[PDB]
Amino acid sequence: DAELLVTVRGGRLRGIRLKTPGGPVSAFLGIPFAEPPMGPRRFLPPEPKQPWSGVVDATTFQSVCYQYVDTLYPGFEGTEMWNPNRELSEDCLYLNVWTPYPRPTSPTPVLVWIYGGGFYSGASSLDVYDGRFLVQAERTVLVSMNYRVGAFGFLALPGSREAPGNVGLLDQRLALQWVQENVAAFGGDPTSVTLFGESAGAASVGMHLLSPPSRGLFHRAVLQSGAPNGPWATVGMGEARRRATQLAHLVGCPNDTELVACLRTRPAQVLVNHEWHVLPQESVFRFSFVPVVDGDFLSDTPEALINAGDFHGLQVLVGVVKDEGSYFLVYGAPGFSKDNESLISRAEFLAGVRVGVPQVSDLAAEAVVLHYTDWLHPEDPARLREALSDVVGDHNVVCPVAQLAGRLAAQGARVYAYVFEHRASTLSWPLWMGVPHGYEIEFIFGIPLDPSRNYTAEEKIFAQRLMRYWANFARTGDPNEPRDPKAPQWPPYTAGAQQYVSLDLRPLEVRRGLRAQACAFWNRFLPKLLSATDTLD
Amino acid sequence: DAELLVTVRGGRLRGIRLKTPGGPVSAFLGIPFAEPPMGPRRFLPPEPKQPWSGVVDATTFQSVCYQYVDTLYPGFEGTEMWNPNRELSEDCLYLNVWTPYPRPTSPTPVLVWIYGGGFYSGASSLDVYDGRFLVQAERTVLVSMNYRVGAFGFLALPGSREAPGNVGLLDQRLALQWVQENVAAFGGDPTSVTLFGESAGAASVGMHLLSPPSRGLFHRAVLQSGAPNGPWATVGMGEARRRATQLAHLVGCPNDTELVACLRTRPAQVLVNHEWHVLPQESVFRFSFVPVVDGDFLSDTPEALINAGDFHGLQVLVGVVKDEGSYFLVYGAPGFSKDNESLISRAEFLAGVRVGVPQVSDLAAEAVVLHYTDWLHPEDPARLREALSDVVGDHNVVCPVAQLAGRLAAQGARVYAYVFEHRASTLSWPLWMGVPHGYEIEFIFGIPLDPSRNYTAEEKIFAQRLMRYWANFARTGDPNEPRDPKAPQWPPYTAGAQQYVSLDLRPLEVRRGLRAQACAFWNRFLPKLLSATDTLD
Amino acid sequence: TMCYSHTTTSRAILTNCGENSCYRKSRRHPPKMVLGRGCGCPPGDDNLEVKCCTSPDKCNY
Amino acid sequence: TMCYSHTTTSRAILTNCGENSCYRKSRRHPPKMVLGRGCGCPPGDDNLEVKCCTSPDKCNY
Ligand SMILES: *[C@@H]1O[C@H](CO)[C@@H](O)[C@H](O)[C@H]1NC(C)=O
Ligand SMILES: *[C@@H]1O[C@H](CO)[C@@H](O)[C@H](O)[C@H]1NC(C)=O
Ligand SMILES: [Cl-]
Ligand SMILES: [Cl-]
Ligand SMILES: [Cl-]
Ligand SMILES: [Cl-]
Ligand SMILES: [Cl-]
Ligand SMILES: [Cl-]
Ligand SMILES: [Cl-]
Ligand SMILES: [Cl-]
Ligand SMILES: [Cl-]
Ligand SMILES: [Cl-]
Ligand SMILES: [Cl-]
Ligand SMILES: [Cl-]
Ligand SMILES: [Cl-]
Ligand SMILES: [Cl-]
Ligand SMILES: [Cl-]
Ligand SMILES: [Cl-]
């Protein structure tokens, strides 16, 4: 007790003590930071929570933002694990603060977590996002918020005052402002705030980097397995109103005002029911409602900004898992299921390329096939398994991240890059998938420390070691111990040398080139090709 | 003496005894096999030499076919070495026979050599083509002929009776017929005749394979560093008359009859003077007068025939040197000379691609650059040296040969493939060039055995070993000793497994894949691209 | 037959379809997201794919 | 100056150009085949490139 009571600009809160092997932590869960975006407020940017009388109960996570529930594999941990765990509500804008015990004296550095989930799903309450071990082990303040997803967060009628778009990102910002204002109340230091996210979470982080109104809300950024310049991460204005209007028609609607008005009368579930129809189609790793390049939140396309931007005085941590593309293949690519080894024919391969690489000329797929085929072993199913897992991996993640990493480093920032290549012993996906998208998190958050879970000894160490890396970055903008020999040094990623480290149970190992040959195809050459195939219509 | 006298269908000959370390050999040099293609016979297919009274002196090589003399590097062995050594004449259709001493009793297998020289140059009299060591060491009959080159051999006005084209190949055929008729006179067995050539020489061999009127003139084929389906090896009918007419206009000429009539009045040297003008331009590894796809000698394009052809009952030996493209780069590519290390800038590289890969869309060069660039080291001069040496190498040689090799094997033939990767200690080209085009020959012909030359001990063995390989193939259609353990086995090249051996001072080593990834670009993908870039005009 | 049952916004749960069939609604094209499961055989469409079954039991998985 | 001298169909040979200049005729574009060398400075053309020199001696190499 004693310090479960805390007062913030808005009012009083009552927290809860979470138990860790190492010792206790103070958690404050479900703090209202916005006026619930309901009724007329649906699709509208968030308004700051008005102050309350009384003491708000913050001993438990508040409802998850209204989202689609992934049911592909009924009763399967690997998918169910990211499914909503609290009740589902539009009234969902609440955040959470973890802080050491006893509350630190001098202000300590703050980590802010933005979850991913393709911009259509996610929750701060997910078991794998428990902040208790990270805070206890590296004594820092941990904050995570819920932000609106799916249509409720990103449906946009560009230029509209009733549905501006990007409001899910706006939710993230409101919370970051809340942090400037209130984190000192927990021993948090608003002058040292680091952003870290995963996937869509990472792509968000990357957008706060590129949106000036947010630049003064944080000082450091960590992007894990994602980036704003990913092909799935942003949609154009033309495209966005196409999708919103499709959804409207699908739901019986009905002038942008009367369109959105009508839209606001429909039950939340009716909207989610029709979410997946509005997708341009024939694709894996694509989502209906994502951030728009409206000229507002982002003034140009993430790529355009990254190129012009000056980044001096910034430190960024970027990384990916070893097999990014693997699990997405079970959502379409012919011959792929989790319930066998997905040993595809040369013919399922050629068909999958069209899936894993949406709307792209015929000549373009040839070019992919040209690159990802081992011409010594063109028919080897196992080889064609990994190949398509790389096509999807590199196109959607490893090459957008590596581009970014190089553009930042080259333009003022100090960058550190990693490849996470260790498969959880508890992993519940098939072995062919290797180290899949999103399975470095449980380690970063030190979940292996939880004794009621079945991780190995070396692994419990691994997470510790890793948490140190993250903590050292947030404090200093440099992951490797302030001064530690004979420990291998994690050098900064640069545009030329291109150095990164491989996080696994072995000590740090330094590699050069983040899929450097593959990315030259995706980044340099492919766009020169599409430019031409398009002026061939 | 004793057996330097020999009589052939045409008349009597007097040969000469050549000395070898191992012992003597009988040579018969400069045997007329055609009526000299002069005056009205210029550009016309060869007529069989009419029989003579008396005894023809065959103790010395007859004049080299009228050709251009390569003077790039005055006083430089490496180029001068392939220059004409006998006087230069149109009256040049003579052949040479080497035979063991004493003349074998039972009929022995015959090797026939067709020299290369881009179809614009060459001579059977070149020091490096001395047949004495091969005949002495493996007791077989060796025959080589001169064939017309440049315009005198290949200028074509398709459909013309006065200049049909392909007559240089016709010269080769006449000689092969001469061999059926007369080789028994030397202990030669007309039922066992193997063709072996190099470069254009190899490309010829490959055309006798695809020209039915020649199929009954030989039983085995060895193609070294060349192939009929090379981009430089054949020209179309439209193109050919373009070049012949350009040459005509250039020389003041003037109806195909009066065109060729006039053409026939010009001195030989006036014709050679203007040979290199008629080239479409901006290219290395391209030549003005080469075989035409006229529908006559070849009924379709070498590629078309190779694909349809049935090849059961055939044995072929195919190979290349380790660095095919290297020396050609000094004939244009910016930054390349033999007198330094040709460490090019990234910018000379990009410019060279346009040279080493003639008339090809912009998007196409990008695609080359995409493949041949190490994106870990895009500016490394040494790396860009080899890269462009491979671009030229693979495009012009290694991929046309490897395609052929795979198509043959797959369609009835038994194929054996090699990579020659040993640099002559006597080599006179710079070290950056490695093992360059045409420098396996001196070894095949066992020239290192010549004691007045400065080869090492291991090398003298190498040639011996190699000559055995060739001899074993000619006799049996299989290079490795009839029955020899524990000697590594040279397996047949097949379309799938793609096995080859690496001929060097080490024992046979078996590799899979003849530049398999590069060739998939050149053979599979590039043509799909050019198909599209062309329907973009 | 004991079959899976849920909506767009709910976890999968077992249910007694008993007499008659089960269905598995999903996105016809990639991504083939599962949109629901229950008792019966409902029409599909351009975007909706419905897979029906009766025998295997929890077959609409 | 002692310079190189030859034609399309002959080996290169040294010669006394002495008073005045030397030339090196070649194919302007790749392949840049050398077409001749001798004394003087002769016109070139679209296809013919002529490089002139006087000082170095055997400079038309
Ligand atoms: C794996 O299972 C899926 C669905 O049952 C199917 O698409 C595929 O044929 C299977 N792969 C095999 C049997 O190799
Ligand atoms: C090599 O020599 C040639 C001709 O002198 C020239 O093109 C090139 O600049 C030289 N390379 C160097 C100096 O690196
Ligand atoms: Cl608990
Ligand atoms: Cl109060
Ligand atoms: Cl749960
Ligand atoms: Cl737009
Ligand atoms: Cl730029
Ligand atoms: Cl797309
Ligand atoms: Cl294919
Ligand atoms: Cl410690
Ligand atoms: Cl700092
Ligand atoms: Cl490496
Ligand atoms: Cl790579
Ligand atoms: Cl001699
Ligand atoms: Cl007589
Ligand atoms: Cl000589
Ligand atoms: Cl034609
Ligand atoms: Cl075919």
Ligand SMILES: [Cl-]
């Ligand atoms: Cl060409």
Ligand SMILES: [Cl-]
């Ligand atoms: Cl470039």
Ligand SMILES: [Cl-]
């Ligand atoms: Cl022996």
Ligand SMILES: [Cl-]
């Ligand atoms: Cl036989």
Ligand SMILES: [Cl-]
């Ligand atoms: Cl190998």
Ligand SMILES: [Cl-]
């Ligand atoms: Cl290769």
